[PDB]
Amino acid sequence: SMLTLPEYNEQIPNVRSLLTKWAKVERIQDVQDGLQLDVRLKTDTLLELHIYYDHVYHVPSIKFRLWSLDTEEDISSLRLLTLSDSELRSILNLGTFSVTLSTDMEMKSVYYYINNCDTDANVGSDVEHYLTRWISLYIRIFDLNFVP
């Protein structure tokens, strides 16, 4: 893949544009390095989808974190969640895909770096609808009911 940063950022507002279709998406926020949305996997579970480009392979990446909304008192609180793959699959859809979960030095924060090393292999070279064919391709790991 040769999709540069300015090449993938050109379709940044294209991914979210379709991402809007997501029924779980409750919040829509863009960033200067991808996008930041708030997917509501569960009424008490929030999955912060964080998209970021990687010049490593010249392609976009995927990084999300599970959250646990706790309204014990009804303050709209939440707390990062952490489970194994089998448990992480209870919501996400890996199937044959691959993911890499790593914790921080403080072991208080972690992320779910989805395997996006060989995207062109799956997505392709179509730089036209890549950001779409990519997300819509990597979205099947979050929602198999939402086909953008």
Tokens (6 digits) for 49: 């989808």
Residue 15 DSSP SS3: helix
Determination technique used: NMR
- How far is CA 80 from each of CA 31, 37, 65, 117, 122, rounded to the nearest angstrom? 21, 16, 7, 26, 30
Find how far residue 99's CA is from the centre of its chain.
11
Residues designated catalytic: 117
Q: Domain tally for the chain?
A: 1
CB 39 within 8 Å of CB 25: yes
**C-alpha to C-alpha distance for 129 and 91, rounded to whole angstroms:** 27
Residue 9: burial class (beta carbons within 10 Å; 0-12, 13-18, 19+): middle
Where residue 76 sits, what CATH number does that domain have?
Answer: 3.30.1460.50
Q: DSSP assignment, residue 92?
A: S
Q: Which helix (H) or strand (E) holds 134?
A: helix 130-138
Count the Cβ atoms, other than its own, within 10 Å of residue 49. Answer: 23
Q: Exposed, middle or buried by CB within 10 Å (0-12, 13-18, 19+), for 86?
A: exposed
Range of the domain at 94: 1-148
Cβ pair 56, 78 in contact under 8 A:
no
Burial of 79 (0-12, 13-18, 19+ CB in 10 A): exposed
* Contact criterion met (CB below 8 Å) for 10 and 4: no
| CA distances from residue 103 to 19, 22, 23, 90 in whole angstroms, order as listed | 27, 28, 29, 20
Distance CA 138, CA 61 (A): 9
Q: How far apart are CA 132 and CA 135, in angstroms?
A: 5
